[PDB]
mmCIF file of C-alpha atoms and ligand atoms in Angstrom:
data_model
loop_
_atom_site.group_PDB
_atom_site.id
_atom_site.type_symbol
_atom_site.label_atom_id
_atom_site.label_comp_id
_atom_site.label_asym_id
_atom_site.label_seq_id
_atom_site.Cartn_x
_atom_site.Cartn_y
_atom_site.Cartn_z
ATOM 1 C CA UNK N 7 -13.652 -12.746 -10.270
ATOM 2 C CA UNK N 8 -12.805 -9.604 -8.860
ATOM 3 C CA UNK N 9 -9.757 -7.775 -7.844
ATOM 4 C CA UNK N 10 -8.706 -3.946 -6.123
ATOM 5 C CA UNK N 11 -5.181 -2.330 -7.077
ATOM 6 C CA UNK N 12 -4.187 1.110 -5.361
ATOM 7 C CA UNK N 13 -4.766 4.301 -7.516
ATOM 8 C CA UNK N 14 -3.331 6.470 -4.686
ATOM 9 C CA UNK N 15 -3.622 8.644 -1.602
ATOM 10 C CA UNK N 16 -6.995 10.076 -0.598
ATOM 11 C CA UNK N 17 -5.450 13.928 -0.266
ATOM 12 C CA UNK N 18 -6.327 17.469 -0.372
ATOM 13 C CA UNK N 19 -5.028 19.195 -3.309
ATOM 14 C CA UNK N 20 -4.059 22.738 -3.191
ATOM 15 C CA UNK N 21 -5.347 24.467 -6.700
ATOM 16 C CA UNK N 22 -6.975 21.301 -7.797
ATOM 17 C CA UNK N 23 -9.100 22.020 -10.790
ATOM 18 C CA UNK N 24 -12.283 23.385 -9.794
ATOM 19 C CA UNK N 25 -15.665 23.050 -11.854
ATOM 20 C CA UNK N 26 -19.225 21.733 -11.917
ATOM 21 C CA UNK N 27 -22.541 23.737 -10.866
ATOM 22 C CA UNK N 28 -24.760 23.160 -7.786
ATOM 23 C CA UNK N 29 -28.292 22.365 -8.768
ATOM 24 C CA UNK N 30 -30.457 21.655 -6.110
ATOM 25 C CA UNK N 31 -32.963 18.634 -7.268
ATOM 26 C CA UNK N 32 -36.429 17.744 -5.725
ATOM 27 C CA UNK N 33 -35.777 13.997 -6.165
ATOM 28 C CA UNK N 34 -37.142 10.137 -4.660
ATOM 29 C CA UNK N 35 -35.275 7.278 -3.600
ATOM 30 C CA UNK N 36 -36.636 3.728 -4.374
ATOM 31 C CA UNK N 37 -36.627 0.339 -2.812
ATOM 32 C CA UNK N 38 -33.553 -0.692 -5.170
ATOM 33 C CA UNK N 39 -31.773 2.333 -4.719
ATOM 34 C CA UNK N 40 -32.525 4.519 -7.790
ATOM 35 C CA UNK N 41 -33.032 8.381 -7.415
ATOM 36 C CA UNK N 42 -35.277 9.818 -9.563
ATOM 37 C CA UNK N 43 -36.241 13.481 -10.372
ATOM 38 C CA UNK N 44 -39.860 14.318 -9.050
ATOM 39 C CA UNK N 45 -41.787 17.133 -10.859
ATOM 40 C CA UNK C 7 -3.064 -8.472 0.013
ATOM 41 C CA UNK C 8 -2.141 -4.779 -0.152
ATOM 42 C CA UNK C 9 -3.921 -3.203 3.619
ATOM 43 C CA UNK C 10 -2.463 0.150 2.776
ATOM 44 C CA UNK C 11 -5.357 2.931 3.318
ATOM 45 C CA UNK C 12 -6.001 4.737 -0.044
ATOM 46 C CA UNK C 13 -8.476 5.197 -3.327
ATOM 47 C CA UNK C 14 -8.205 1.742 -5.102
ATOM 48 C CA UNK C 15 -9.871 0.752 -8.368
ATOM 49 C CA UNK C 16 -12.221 -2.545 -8.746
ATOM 50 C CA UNK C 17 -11.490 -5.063 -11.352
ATOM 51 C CA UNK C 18 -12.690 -7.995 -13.117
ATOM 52 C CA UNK C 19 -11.451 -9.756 -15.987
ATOM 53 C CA UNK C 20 -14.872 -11.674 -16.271
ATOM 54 C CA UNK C 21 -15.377 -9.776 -19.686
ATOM 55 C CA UNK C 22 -12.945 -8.450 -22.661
ATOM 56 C CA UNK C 23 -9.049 -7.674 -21.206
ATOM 57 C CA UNK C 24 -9.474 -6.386 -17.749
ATOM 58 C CA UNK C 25 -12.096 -4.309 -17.300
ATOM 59 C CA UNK C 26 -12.697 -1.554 -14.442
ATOM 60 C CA UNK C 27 -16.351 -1.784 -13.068
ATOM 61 C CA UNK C 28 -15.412 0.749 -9.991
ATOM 62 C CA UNK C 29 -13.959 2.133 -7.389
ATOM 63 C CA UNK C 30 -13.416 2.168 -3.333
ATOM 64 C CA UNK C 31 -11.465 3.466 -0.587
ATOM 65 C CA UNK C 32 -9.358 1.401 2.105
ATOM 66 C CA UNK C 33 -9.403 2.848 5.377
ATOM 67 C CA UNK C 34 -9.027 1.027 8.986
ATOM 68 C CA UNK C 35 -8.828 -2.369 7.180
ATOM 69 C CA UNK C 36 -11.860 -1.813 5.680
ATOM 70 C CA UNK C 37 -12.842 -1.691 2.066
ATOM 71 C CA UNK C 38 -16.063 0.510 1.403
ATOM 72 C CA UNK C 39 -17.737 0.630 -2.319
ATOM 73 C CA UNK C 40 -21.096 1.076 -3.852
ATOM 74 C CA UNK C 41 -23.171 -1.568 -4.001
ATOM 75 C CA UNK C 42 -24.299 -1.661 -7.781
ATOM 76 C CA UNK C 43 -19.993 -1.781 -8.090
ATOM 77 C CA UNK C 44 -19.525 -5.504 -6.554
ATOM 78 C CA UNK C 45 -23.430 -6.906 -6.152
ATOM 79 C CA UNK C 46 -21.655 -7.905 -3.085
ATOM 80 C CA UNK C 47 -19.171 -10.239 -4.442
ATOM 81 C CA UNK C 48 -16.047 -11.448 -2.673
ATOM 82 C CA UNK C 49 -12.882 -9.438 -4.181
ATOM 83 C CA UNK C 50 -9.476 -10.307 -4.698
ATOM 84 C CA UNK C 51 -6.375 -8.357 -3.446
ATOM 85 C CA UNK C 52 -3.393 -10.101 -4.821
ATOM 86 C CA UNK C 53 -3.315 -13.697 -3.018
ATOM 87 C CA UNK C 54 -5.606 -12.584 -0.132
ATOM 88 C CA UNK C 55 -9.569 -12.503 -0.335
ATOM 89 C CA UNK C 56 -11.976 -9.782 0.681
ATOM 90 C CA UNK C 57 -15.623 -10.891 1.410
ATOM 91 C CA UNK C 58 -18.253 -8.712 2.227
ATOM 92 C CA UNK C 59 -19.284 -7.773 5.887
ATOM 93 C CA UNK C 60 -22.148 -5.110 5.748
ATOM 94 C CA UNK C 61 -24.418 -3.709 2.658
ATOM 95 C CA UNK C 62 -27.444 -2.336 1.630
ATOM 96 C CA UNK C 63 -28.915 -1.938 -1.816
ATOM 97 C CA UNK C 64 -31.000 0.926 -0.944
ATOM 98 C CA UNK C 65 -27.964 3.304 0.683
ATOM 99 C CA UNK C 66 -26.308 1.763 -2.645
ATOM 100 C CA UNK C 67 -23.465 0.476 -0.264
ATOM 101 C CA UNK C 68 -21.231 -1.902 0.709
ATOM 102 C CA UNK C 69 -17.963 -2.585 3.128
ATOM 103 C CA UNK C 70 -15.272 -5.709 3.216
ATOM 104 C CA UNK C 71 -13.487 -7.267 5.916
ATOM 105 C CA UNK C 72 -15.483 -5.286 9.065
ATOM 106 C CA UNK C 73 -17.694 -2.603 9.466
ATOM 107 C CA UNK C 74 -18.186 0.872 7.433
ATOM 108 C CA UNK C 75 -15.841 2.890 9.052
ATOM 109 C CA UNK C 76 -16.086 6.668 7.119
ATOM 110 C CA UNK C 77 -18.566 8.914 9.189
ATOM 111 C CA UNK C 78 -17.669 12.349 7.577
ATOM 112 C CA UNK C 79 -20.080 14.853 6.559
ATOM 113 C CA UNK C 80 -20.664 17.887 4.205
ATOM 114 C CA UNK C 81 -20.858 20.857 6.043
ATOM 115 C CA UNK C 82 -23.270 22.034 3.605
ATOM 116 C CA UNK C 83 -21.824 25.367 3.259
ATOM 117 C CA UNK C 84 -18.046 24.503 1.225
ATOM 118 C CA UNK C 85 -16.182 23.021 -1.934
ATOM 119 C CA UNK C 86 -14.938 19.464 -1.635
ATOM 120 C CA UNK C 87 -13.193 17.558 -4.219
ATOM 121 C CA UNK C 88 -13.990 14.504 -6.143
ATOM 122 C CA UNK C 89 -10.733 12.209 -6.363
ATOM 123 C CA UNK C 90 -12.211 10.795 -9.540
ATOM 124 C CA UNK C 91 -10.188 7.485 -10.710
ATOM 125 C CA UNK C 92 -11.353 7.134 -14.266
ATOM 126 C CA UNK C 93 -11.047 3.730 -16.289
ATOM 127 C CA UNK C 94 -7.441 3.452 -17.844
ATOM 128 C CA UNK C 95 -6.312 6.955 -16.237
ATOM 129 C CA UNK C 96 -4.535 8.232 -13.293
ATOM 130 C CA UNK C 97 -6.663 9.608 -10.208
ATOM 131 C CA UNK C 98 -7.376 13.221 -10.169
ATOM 132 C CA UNK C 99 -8.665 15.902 -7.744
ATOM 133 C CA UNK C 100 -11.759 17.811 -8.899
ATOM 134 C CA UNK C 101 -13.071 20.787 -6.827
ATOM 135 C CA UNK C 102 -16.471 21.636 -6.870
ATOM 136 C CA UNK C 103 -19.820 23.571 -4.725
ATOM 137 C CA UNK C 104 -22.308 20.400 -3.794
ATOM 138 C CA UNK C 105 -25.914 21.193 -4.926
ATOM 139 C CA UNK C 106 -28.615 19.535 -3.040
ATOM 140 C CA UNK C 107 -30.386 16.528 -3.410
ATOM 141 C CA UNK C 108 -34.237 17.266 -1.558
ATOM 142 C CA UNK C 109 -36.073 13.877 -0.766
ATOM 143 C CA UNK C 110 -38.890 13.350 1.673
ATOM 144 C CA UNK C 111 -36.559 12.030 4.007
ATOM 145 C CA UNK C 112 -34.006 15.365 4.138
ATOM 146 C CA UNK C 113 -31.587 16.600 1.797
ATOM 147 C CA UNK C 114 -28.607 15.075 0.627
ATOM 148 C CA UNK C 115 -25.282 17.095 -0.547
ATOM 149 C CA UNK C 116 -24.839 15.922 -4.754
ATOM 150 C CA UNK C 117 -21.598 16.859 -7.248
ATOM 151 C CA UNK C 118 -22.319 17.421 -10.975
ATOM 152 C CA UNK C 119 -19.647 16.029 -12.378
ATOM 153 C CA UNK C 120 -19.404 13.325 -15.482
ATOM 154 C CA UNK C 121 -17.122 10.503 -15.451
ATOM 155 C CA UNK C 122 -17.456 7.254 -16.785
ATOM 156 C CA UNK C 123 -20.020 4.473 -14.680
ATOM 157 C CA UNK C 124 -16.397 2.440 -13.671
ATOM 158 C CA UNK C 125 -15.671 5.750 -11.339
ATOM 159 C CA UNK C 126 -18.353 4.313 -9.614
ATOM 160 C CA UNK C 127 -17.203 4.033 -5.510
ATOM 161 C CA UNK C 128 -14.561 7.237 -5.999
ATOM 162 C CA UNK C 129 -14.362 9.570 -2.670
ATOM 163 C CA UNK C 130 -15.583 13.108 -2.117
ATOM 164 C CA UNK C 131 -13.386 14.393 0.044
ATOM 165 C CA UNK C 132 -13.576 17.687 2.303
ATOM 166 C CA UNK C 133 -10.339 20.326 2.975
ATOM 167 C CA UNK C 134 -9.114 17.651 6.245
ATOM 168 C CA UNK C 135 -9.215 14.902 3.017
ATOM 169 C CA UNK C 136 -11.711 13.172 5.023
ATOM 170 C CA UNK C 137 -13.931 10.955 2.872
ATOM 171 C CA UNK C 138 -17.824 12.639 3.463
ATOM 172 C CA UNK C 139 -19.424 9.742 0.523
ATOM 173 C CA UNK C 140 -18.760 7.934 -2.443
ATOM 174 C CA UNK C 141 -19.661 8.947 -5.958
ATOM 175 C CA UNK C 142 -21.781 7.038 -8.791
ATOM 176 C CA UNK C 143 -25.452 6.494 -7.206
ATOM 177 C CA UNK C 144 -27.345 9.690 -8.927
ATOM 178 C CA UNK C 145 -29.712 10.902 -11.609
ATOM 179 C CA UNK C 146 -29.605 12.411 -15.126
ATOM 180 C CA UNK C 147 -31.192 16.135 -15.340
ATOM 181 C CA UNK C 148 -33.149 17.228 -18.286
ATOM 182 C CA UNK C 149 -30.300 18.574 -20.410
ATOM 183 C CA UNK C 150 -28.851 14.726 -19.835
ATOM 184 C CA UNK C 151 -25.977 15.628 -17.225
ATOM 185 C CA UNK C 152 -25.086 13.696 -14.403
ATOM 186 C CA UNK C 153 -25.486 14.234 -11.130
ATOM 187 C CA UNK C 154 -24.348 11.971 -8.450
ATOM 188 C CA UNK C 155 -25.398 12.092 -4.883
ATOM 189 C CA UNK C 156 -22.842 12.232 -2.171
ATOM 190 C CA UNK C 157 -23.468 8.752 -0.419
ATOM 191 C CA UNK C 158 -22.625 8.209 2.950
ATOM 192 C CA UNK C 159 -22.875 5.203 5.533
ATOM 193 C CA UNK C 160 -23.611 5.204 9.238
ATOM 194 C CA UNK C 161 -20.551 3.695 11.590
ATOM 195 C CA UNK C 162 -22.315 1.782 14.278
HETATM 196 N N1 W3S X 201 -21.797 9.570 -15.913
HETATM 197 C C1 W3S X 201 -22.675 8.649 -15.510
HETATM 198 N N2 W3S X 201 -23.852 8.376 -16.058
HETATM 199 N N3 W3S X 201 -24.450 7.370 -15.293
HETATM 200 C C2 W3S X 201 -23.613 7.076 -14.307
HETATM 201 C C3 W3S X 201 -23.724 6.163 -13.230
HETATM 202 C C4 W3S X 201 -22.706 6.070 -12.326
HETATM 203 C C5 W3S X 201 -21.550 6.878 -12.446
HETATM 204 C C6 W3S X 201 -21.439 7.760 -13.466
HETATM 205 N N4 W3S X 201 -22.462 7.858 -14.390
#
């Protein structure tokens, strides 16, 4: 049985941290919803 | 049950203690997730019940209580931030430059960041801290990072 409980305001933050890359990925979508990478 | 709009984390205490399996956001008295999150279970909030309205295994997506109600975009050109709500810790804004996800059917925005699979259903947001997708439906790259797509439904 499931249950939500609030983690908080969906916000903007000024001088949040900032990280992560941008690859861009040739990739497929299947019937159940999986990407996968094509090559 | 608590109505409030906001980032809320998903629950069960089906296995060991109480366990978070994801994430979702409440907006316009609707709850939106990812699919793989809920397998489109009824939820609980406090003495009220949730049960689904629309979803779709393939978009990886679901929404409680009426239709899905975010329609914002990536403007494929700036940062946005993930407000990542980890298992067992505090949300947190994390800024990042969307790559691309190309498919047959058009491109997709994706964020390359690594959190746990119970993040599963936290919002990307752009600089107006509207929600443009959810994060946790992606792949793993050769070097074995993650990358999730930045999934978004369609509000009739
Ligand atoms: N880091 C990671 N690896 N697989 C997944 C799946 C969903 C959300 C996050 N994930």
């Amino acid at each position: 049985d499931m249950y939500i409980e609030r983690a908080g305001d969906i916000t903007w933050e000024k001088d949040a941290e900032v990280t992560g890359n941008s690859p861009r990925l040739d990739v497929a979508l299947d019937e159940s919803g999986d990407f996968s990478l094509v090559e | 049950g608590e109505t409030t709009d906001g980032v809320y984390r998903v629950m069960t205490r089906r296995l060991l203690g109480s366990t978070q399996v994801g994430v979702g956001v409440m907006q316009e008295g609707v709850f939106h997730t990812m699919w793989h999150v809920t397998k489109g279970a009824a939820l609980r909030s406090g003495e009220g019940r949730l049960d689904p309205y629309w979803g779709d295994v393939k978009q990886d997506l679901v929404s409680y209580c009426g239709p899905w109600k975010l329609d914002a975009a990536w403007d494929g050109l700036s940062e946005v931030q993930l407000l990542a709500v980890p298992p067992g810790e505090r949300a947190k804004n994390i800024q990042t430059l969307p790559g691309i996800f190309k498919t047959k059917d058009g491109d997709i925005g994706a964020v390359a960041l690594d959190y746990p699979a119970g993040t599963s259903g936290s919002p990307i947001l752009d600089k107006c801290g509207r929600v443009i997708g959810l994060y946790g439906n992606g792949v793993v790259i050769k070097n074995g990072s993650y990358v999730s797509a930045i999934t978004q439904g369609k509000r009739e």
